[PDB]
Amino acid sequence: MLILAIISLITFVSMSKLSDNRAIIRLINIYLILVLVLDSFLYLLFLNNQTYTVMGELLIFNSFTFYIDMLIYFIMIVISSLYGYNLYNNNLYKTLFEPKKELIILFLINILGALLIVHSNDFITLFVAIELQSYSIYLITAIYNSSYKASKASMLYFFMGGILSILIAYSINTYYSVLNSYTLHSLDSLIINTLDLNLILIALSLGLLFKIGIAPLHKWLISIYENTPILITIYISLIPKISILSYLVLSNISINSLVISILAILTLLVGSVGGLLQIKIKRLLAFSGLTNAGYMMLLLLLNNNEFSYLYYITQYSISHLAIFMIIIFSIYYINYINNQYNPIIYVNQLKGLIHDNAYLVLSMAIVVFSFIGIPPLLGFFGKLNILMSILNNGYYFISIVLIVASLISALYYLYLLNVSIQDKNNILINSNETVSSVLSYILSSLIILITFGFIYNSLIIDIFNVYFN
């Protein structure tokens, strides 16, 4: 029911004016809510990890894919509930964060492109769907055309995504050259012994992986994330990561991979030591994206990674989403506003935030402790369940470097708190206008998931046991 939305709304947005864009996005938000509420009984289809192949060996519908398929709609409701809703009703807050006319179209075209990878079986559905979502990132980036950094960022992302798309197509063509089939189950565990496939299957992996930020090629993505406006980048940092990582994790084509193990170590090294001396907040935040997307090639090395992956992905998506929404709240209290597209740029700028309000720093403190794995929080059990699989299957140096990477990373997570609880000299005594109700209720709910998800941890393990085994 994405395309039932897209085909309808594209005719609806073609005729509506520029003032109607907010209420269009509000409509699409409520539509996605009711698709999640009235249609989420399709979990009953699987009961014992039952998998369906639909459209004729072309799509693959199982329950891992159903969970990612539900996760993406949930985070899209949280993202679309930002563009729909005003932050404050002021002159500044109308000229900041303006949604373009075609933006709401490109989100749902990207979700179509992201869902048709996690659900994908054939290589041609893989290739058409990485193309659909890569175009949508080319155009979600460039839709704020009257920005110098955003246009330079879209033009860089174009050529780098183009090289990695031709590398993937070369690997797909090459696997076709050595075996007649395109589907991954033509492997069926007898090929791989009697066939040198390691080089093909890694080059297929590394083609997607380098699109996401695998760390010899991490420098271009950090530049694109720092250059886009602060609301394009929460979406274009969440979506391609989780979509292809659940692809590469559903179809375990690189087990024991030495190239993947090296680049996993190199990711955990250079992310945690790259974020150390950095003064821009989206930078710091994107290398926190990099180390956490490098607790991913680890599970990609494993076999049977569907508790560790799924728990850590919904952990990371809530935590990610919440801390971007915290600094989007934090821009009202700062003293200096530059650069209309990207209003807070430096982490020096959110000083003394506890003297402005204390509960936004309470929220910020629980999310930044959830990134560094503090045990009564939901972000802890993600690293715990990665480590119950890394050590389960023989990766011992990987475990030590995982630990050292977590410790070096916490040093620049805690810089956010070191800045935000300090004396400011100019405290707020009375704000005349208050922040939007629903858009702060969303962050309060995303906190209370993080701080109280260990309550339901045990239910999730039993549910999981039934529905994936």
Ligand X SMILES: CCCCCCCCCCCCCCCCCC(=O)OC[C@H](COP(=O)([O-])OCC(O)COP(=O)([O-])OC[C@@H](COC(=O)CCCCCCCCCCCCCCCCC)OC(=O)CCCCCCCCCCCCCCCCC)OC(=O)CCCCCCCCCCCCCCCCC
Ligand Y SMILES: CCCCC/C=C/C/C=C/C/C=C\C/C=C\CCCC(=O)O[C@H](COC(=O)CCCCCCCCCCCCCCCCC)COP(=O)(O)O[C@@H]1[C@H](O)[C@H](O)[C@@H](O)[C@H](O)[C@H]1O
Ligand Z SMILES: CCCCC/C=C\C/C=C\CCCCCCCC(=O)O[C@H](COC(=O)CCCCCCCCCCCCCCC)COP(=O)([O-])OCC[N+](C)(C)C
Name the token pair of 311.
């728990």
Q: Interface with ligand X includes 1 (CB under 6 A)?
A: yes
Which CB sits closer to ligand Y, 81 or 233? 81
Interaction of residue 259 with ligand Y, rule CB under 6 A: yes
Q: How far is the CB of 270 from another protein (least distance, A)?
A: 22
For ligand X, give the closer residue by CB, 103 or 300: 103
The partner in contact with residue 258, picked from another protein, ligand Y, ligand X, none with C-beta cut-offs of 5 to 8 angstroms by kind, is ligand Y
- Residue 80 CA, distance from chain mean position: 15
384 is a contact residue toward ligand Z (CB under 6 A) = no
In this structure, what token pair is assigned to residue 295?
């607790």
Choose, by CB under 6 A, the member of 8, 14, 40, 392 that binds ligand Z: 40
Return d(Cα 461, Cα 468) in angstroms, integer: 10
Nearer to another protein, 210 or 329 (CB): 329
| 208 contacts ligand Y (rule: CB under 6 A) | no
3-state secondary structure of 54: strand
At how many degrees (to 10) do helices 396-413 and 359-371 cross?
160
Single-letter amino acid, residue 180: N
Instruction: Establish if 460 lies at the interface with ligand Z (CB under 6 A).
Output: yes
Rounded to a whole number of angstroms, the minimum distance from the CB of residue 171 to ligand Z is: 30
Q: Which does 195 bind (CB under 5 to 8 A by kind): ligand Z, ligand X, another protein, none?
A: another protein
Q: Which stretch binds ligand Z (CB under 6 A): 24-32, 167-175, 424-432, 449-457?
A: 449-457
Between CA 286 and CA 303 the distance in angstroms is: 28
Residue 198 as a binder of ligand Y (CB under 6 A): the answer is yes
* Cα–Cα distance, 445 to 283 (Å, whole number): 26
Axis crossing angle, helix 378-390 with helix 359-371, rounded to the nearest 10:
0
Name the segment binding ligand Z (CB under 6 A); options: 154-162, 216-224, 237-245, 307-315.
307-315
- Partner in contact with 41, chosen from ligand X, another protein, ligand Y, none, beta carbon below 5 to 8 Å by kind: another protein
Residue partners of 390: CB distance under 8 A and separation at least 6? 298, 302, 398, 399, 402
Instruction: Output 1 or 400, the one with its CB closest to another protein.
Output: 1
Supply the DSSP string of 291-337, one letter for each residue. Answer: HHTTSSHHHHHSSS-SSHHHHHHHHHHHHHHHHHHHHHHHTTT-S--
67 binds ligand Z (CB under 6 A): yes
Of the ranges 114-122, 161-169, 231-239, 280-288, which one interacts with ligand Y (CB under 6 A)? Answer: 161-169
Q: Which does 378 bind (CB under 5 to 8 A by kind): another protein, ligand X, ligand Z, none?
A: ligand Z
Question: Closest by alpha carbon to 104, among 72, 131, 82?
Answer: 82
Name the residue type at position 19.
S
Site for ligand Y in 70-89 (CB under 6 A): 77-78, 81
35 belongs to the binding site for ligand Z (CB under 6 A): no
- Residues 5 to 24 in contact with ligand X, rule: CB under 6 A: 8, 11-12, 15-16
- Applying CB under 6 A, which of residues 23, 279, 438, 466 lies at the interface with ligand Y? 438
60's enclosing H/E stretch is strand 59-61
Residue in the structure block whose two tokens are 């998931």: 449
- Which residues lie below 8 Å from residue 434, measured CB to CB, with a gap of 6+? 88
